[PDB]
């Protein structure tokens, strides 16, 4: 195996195990009732080897503070915590707001890490996958996860209509395949349930092209190390964030 | 445009709209109520040209029985409707039981299809990979969606340990990386709702190896054109099923 001191001996940001951030249904209980849950879930991973131990103590408030006052003293343990709280601190919202209306706001979404990381051709574009219900452009809004400053906008041609959101904490958060944007340009500050965007079918071909896909959002979340920007699963704190959507009027 | 005509001049089960399966809301909840949906949804492929136009009637019973009776006086009909009812038609459950007792018997799916099917190295493999919520193997029985005979039982590298029903209108369903088999042999006859196997991480090496990849069912529904075995879209007759979950004590 490899213990947890030895992973805090390397960057954390790009070991395969931080990046798939596995998080059991335990822990996903747990973490929505957490005042830190970017610590916790970061003690939870180094007190488990990335869930390949079991984990010793009792998982609960007094559990992670007897953790974080150990694991504190680390070198290293700086660094990876900021890790874990730009994924985990910043998010607010759920990026799809709920109906306040009796309209349709039902969305889908699986942890796809494992299949796009193993031969997918999606290298640097790997995050979660937001489907529509309803399969039509221009509907459903897409909200800022977080606060935080438009950092990029426009075309991409993998990604068509996008929107980049540096969070606080550091973290990039990415918006994908928009139908349209918000009256936001580069250096904009947001607030965590602003609107972005509205989700649509945009990419694969020239500027402006649509309706190549099924409608969806695809969600990125990226953090830098070194020079590069790795992108990690999104998925997990996509679950955390599911019962906290904003209300919207749709229509 | 190429014409619901057009379309039926030729073999319908290789062309890419029909694989797709393409099916709006209006039509999900129309198919939910429908007597025989495998022709209600050929019709409504017929007379949108696989909604590429509006859809010229009424959605209801007495629109698809004026459509019908237009319809069944192609030549091609027959092969055509046989297609779609062979998908529709013998469906009676969702594969994934619901829990008797109070456990947890949530999973989460998509329509991968596009994903799948555009520079997707998955070429044969195209399904709906439906995914545990509890992420562990031997817990979620899949049951049988349909009756038919056990066509094929055991390993594949990139299905794990998978076995596979033919179904009494001439579907087969594909079901893979299962933890365990029930007490099935090749040649054994089926009903719908009965267990073949539970939910695993079954695949990706030599027979019997697990763990490679996160706990899901992998679906796949093949019709047979010529002498290949052509794979469709099994997302829209999965949630036309979504509601038929046999109840069953898990633990």
């Given at each position: 195996?490899?213990?947890?001191f030895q992973?805090?001996?390397?960057?954390?940001?790009?070991?395969?195990?931080?990046?798939?951030?596995?998080?059991?249904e335990?822990?996903?209980v747990?973490?929505?009732?957490?005042?830190?849950?970017?610590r916790?879930v970061?003690?939870y991973?180094?007190?488990?080897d990335?869930?390949?131990r079991?984990?010793?103590?009792?998982?609960?408030?007094?559990?992670?503070?007897?953790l974080?006052?150990?694991w504190?003293?680390?070198?290293?343990?700086?660094?990876?915590?900021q890790?874990?709280?730009?994924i985990?601190?910043?998010?607010k919202?759920?990026?799809?707001?709920?109906?306040?209306?009796?309209?349709?706001?039902?969305?889908?979404?699986?942890?796809?890490?494992?299949?796009?990381?193993?031969?997918?051709?999606?290298?640097?574009?790997?995050?979660?996958?937001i489907?529509?219900?309803?399969?039509?452009?221009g509907?459903?809004?897409?909200?800022?996860?977080?606060?935080?400053?438009?950092?990029?906008?426009?075309?991409?041609?993998?990604?068509?209509w996008?929107?980049?959101?540096?969070?606080?904490?550091?973290?990039?958060?990415?918006?994908a395949?928009?139908?349209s944007?918000?009256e936001?340009?580069?250096?904009?500050?947001?607030?965590?349930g602003?609107?972005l965007g509205?989700?649509?079918?945009?990419?694969?071909?020239?500027?402006?092209?649509?309706?190549?896909?099924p409608?969806?959002?695809?969600?990125?979340?990226?953090?830098?190390?070194?020079?590069?920007?790795?992108?990690?699963?999104?998925?997990?704190?996509?679950?955390?964030?599911?019962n906290?959507r904003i209300?919207?009027?749709?229509?």
């Amino acid at each position: 195996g490899v213990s947890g001191f030895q992973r805090l001996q390397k960057p954390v940001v790009s070991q395969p195990d931080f990046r798939r951030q596995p998080v059991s249904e335990t822990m996903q209980v747990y973490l929505k009732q957490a005042a830190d849950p970017g610590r916790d879930v970061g003690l939870y991973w180094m007190a488990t080897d990335f869930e390949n131990r079991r984990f010793p103590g009792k998982v609960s408030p007094s559990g992670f503070q007897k953790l974080y006052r150990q694991w504190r003293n680390q070198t290293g343990w700086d660094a990876y915590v900021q890790s874990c709280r730009a994924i985990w601190n910043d998010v607010k919202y759920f990026p799809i707001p709920q109906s306040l209306d009796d309209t349709e706001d039902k969305i889908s979404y699986v942890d796809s890490w494992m299949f796009e990381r193993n031969y997918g051709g999606k290298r640097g574009h790997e995050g979660t996958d937001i489907m529509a219900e309803k399969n039509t452009p221009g509907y459903y809004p897409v909200v800022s996860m977080t606060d935080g400053v438009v950092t990029e906008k426009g075309w991409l041609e993998k990604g068509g209509w996008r929107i980049g959101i540096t969070a606080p904490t550091g973290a990039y958060f990415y918006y994908a395949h928009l139908d349209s944007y918000a009256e936001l340009e580069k250096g904009d500050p947001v607030k965590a349930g602003d609107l972005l965007g509205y989700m649509g079918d945009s990419g694969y071909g020239e500027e402006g092209t649509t309706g190549e896909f099924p409608v969806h959002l695809h969600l990125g979340i990226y953090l830098k190390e070194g020079t590069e920007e790795i992108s990690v699963n999104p998925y997990p704190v996509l679950r955390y964030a599911e019962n906290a959507r904003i209300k919207c009027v749709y229509s």
